C-alpha cells in the first residue's frame, strides 16, 4: 500500500485533559524509572518507552478525577503498556504491581480489589492467546479477534478504573448486567480506534490481533477499503454506545448519581482515549511530535508519520 | 571535566501548570508547523525543535491566564526560541563578521514587519504579524509601544552576543548580566506577565516601583537558565553565560563555578522575595493590579525553572524528564538526567 487516508472520525464524546495532565505524565515517568527501569535492556530502551508519552493517557481518560487517583491510574496504564510492548517484542514486575495495588486498593471496596486482580488475569490471558496466535502466524476472523481483544485490550480494568476515578462501585450493577450493551459498544469503539491508529506499529511489529490485519489478510481488502470499513464501524459502535447509554440513563436506574457518574466516566474514557491515540509517538513513530492534525494522508511504513492534506 | 553536580536549588516560588498546558503545547506545535516549518532545513530538523517541548514553557509561566492569552504567550516563546536558536547558530548566521551581520540585518528587517500595515514578505515577518495582531488586541497603546521597545532590546542583546562570540571575548560578570537583561527578553517577559494577568503596569514600571523586584527576579531567571543550559552552551561555544564567565574570566573550575552560581540563585531568589514583599507592604501593595502582576512574576520565576528541568533543549534530543531536579549531570552524554552518583 505505502500511504492511506484516515478520514475525520465522529468524535461525539467529551475528550478532556486532567488539569494536572502534563505534571502527572512527568511524575508517572518518574514512577516507571524507579519501578520498571530494569525491565529495559538500556537507558535508550527506557527513553524510547517514555517518549511515547504513555503517562498522559491516564489523565486524558479521567480529566474529572482527584489528582491522587489520576496519578494512580496514569502509572497503572504505563505499567500495563510496558507489559503490552514486551508481548509484541515479589518478582520483576511484582514490586511495581504491589506499589499500584497498595495505592489503588486504599480507595477501592473489597469487591473492587478482587475485580482488579481478575481484570489483570483477563489482560494476561488475552496477551498469552495473542503470543500463540503470533508464533503460529494465523490471523483470526473478525469476531474471534474481537473475542480475544475483550481480555487483551483490558476492558475489565478500563471499566473498573472508570469506577475508581468516579468514586463509585458498580460491582452489583455489573453482575446484574445493567451495562452489558453499554460495555459492548463502548469497548468495541475503543478497540477499533486503537486498531486504526496502532496499525503503523502493529504492521511493523507483525502483530496478528488487529482488525486491520483481519480485513486486509483474511477478508483480502485493500488498506484504504479496510480503513473506510473500520472508520464506518467506529461511527456505528460510538452512536450505539450513545444509544445504549441514553437507555440506561432514561431507564429505571438512570436517576442514580453513581450510575450517571460512571457513564460520564466511560464518555471521557472513550473520547479521551482517541485524543491520546493521535498524540502518541507509540503510533506516529519515535521522533514524532503531535501538531494537533486528526485526519488526512499518513504513511504506513515511514519511521515517523503525520496527517497531511495530500499524498 | 565530563560532568558536574547540581545541588538542590531553593525553589521557594510557585511553579504551576496552566490547567490546559498539555493541549496548549500541542496547539503551539500546530502553530510552529503552520508558520515556521519552512524556516527549518527539513521536516526532521522541525521535529528536533518540536521535541524540545518549548510549547509548554508558556503554560508553565502563566498558569493563571485565560486560555487564549496563554496560547498567545506559548506561541510567542516558541517563536523567540526559534529566533534564539537561529542567531546563536554560526552555521545558519556565518562564522565571520561580514556574513553574520548581513544575515542578522535580514532577521531584524523580517521581525520589524511585525506591527506594519502591509503583509510581510518573510516567514519570520508573517509569524511576528500573527503574534502582534493576537497579543496587541489585549494591550493599551503604551503596552504596544513597550512591546516595540522590548523586541528592539532583545535584538540589541542578540547582536552583542553575536559580536562577543565572533571576537572570542567573554564578558566579565556584570557585563554579562547587562547584556542578558536585553538578550534574555526581560522587557518582553515583564510585558507578557502584565498581559497574562490582564493589567497595565506601564506607569508603575516607568515610576520605578518594580526596579528591585525586576533586578533580582531577572537575575534569578538568567542564572537558573545558565546552570540548566550549560550542557548545551558548552557544546555550542556560546560566551554569554555566567558559567563561562566564572570559569574563563575568574579562573574557577566548573564545580566551583556551579556552586558559586547556585549560591547566587539563592541570593537573588531571596532578594526577589524581599523586594516583592516590600512592594506588597508599601503604598501600592493593596492595588489588585499590583498583587496580580507580582503573583504573575512569582509564577514566571518558578514556572521557568520547572520548564528548564523538563526540556530536551538542555538534556539532549531523546531525553524525557523523570521529575528529578538535583544530582550529577554528564556534559558528554548524548542524553543527560540527574543521577545519585558521579561516573566512576
Ligand atoms: Mg499492543
Ligand atoms: Mg495488546
Ligand atoms: Mg493496537
Ligand atoms: Mg539567547
Ligand atoms: Mg540561547
Ligand atoms: Mg541559556
Numbering used by the authors:
A (entry chain B): 32 to 120, 152 to 373
B (entry chain A): 32 to 375
What does the paper say about this structure?
Diterpene synthase VenA is responsible for assembling venezuelaene A with a unique 5-5-6-7 tetracyclic skeleton from geranylgeranyl pyrophosphate. VenA also demonstrates substrate promiscuity by accepting geranyl pyrophosphate and farnesyl pyrophosphate as alternative substrates. A promiscuous DTS VenA containing an atypical 115DSFVSD120 motif was characterized to catalyze the unique cyclization of geranylgeranyl pyrophosphate (GGPP, C20), giving rise to 1. The monomer of VenA holds a typical isoprenoid synthase α-fold comprised of twelve core α-helices and four additional short α-helices.
In the PPi-(Mg2+)3-bound form, a trinuclear magnesium cluster is coordinated in an octahedral manner by the conserved amino acid residues in the Asp-rich and NSE motifs, PPi group and water molecules. Specifically, Mg2+A and Mg2+C are coordinated by ten oxygen atoms of Asp115, PPi group, and surrounding water molecules on the same side of the active site. In the opposite side of the active site, Mg2+B is coordinated by six oxygen atoms of NSE triad (Asn256, Ser260 and Glu264), PPi group, and one water molecule. The hydrogen bonds between coordinated water molecules and Glu192, Ser214, and Asp257 were also observed in the PPi-(Mg2+)3-bound form of VenA. Upon coordination with the trinuclear magnesium cluster, Asp115 and NSE motif stretch towards the active site and lead to the movement of C and H helices, which reduces the volume of substrate binding cavity. Meanwhile, the PPi group forms a number of hydrogen bonds with the “PPi sensor” residues Arg211 and Lys263 in the NSE motif, and the 344RY345 dimer in the active site of VenA, which play crucial roles in substrate trapping and conversion. Besides the amino acid residues in metal-binding motifs, Arg344 and Tyr108 in the active site of PPi-(Mg2+)3-bound VenA rotate by a wide margin compared with those in apo form. Meanwhile, the guanidine group of Arg344 is rotated towards the PPi group, thereby forming a hydrogen bond. Ser116 and Gln83 in the PPi-(Mg2+)3-bound form may help maintaining the hydrophobic catalytic pocket by interacting with Arg344. The results clearly indicated that only the first Asp115 is required for VenA’s activity; supporting this, Asp120 was found to be located outside of the active site and far from the PPi group (9.4 Å), Mg2+A (7.9 Å) and Mg2+C (9.1 Å).
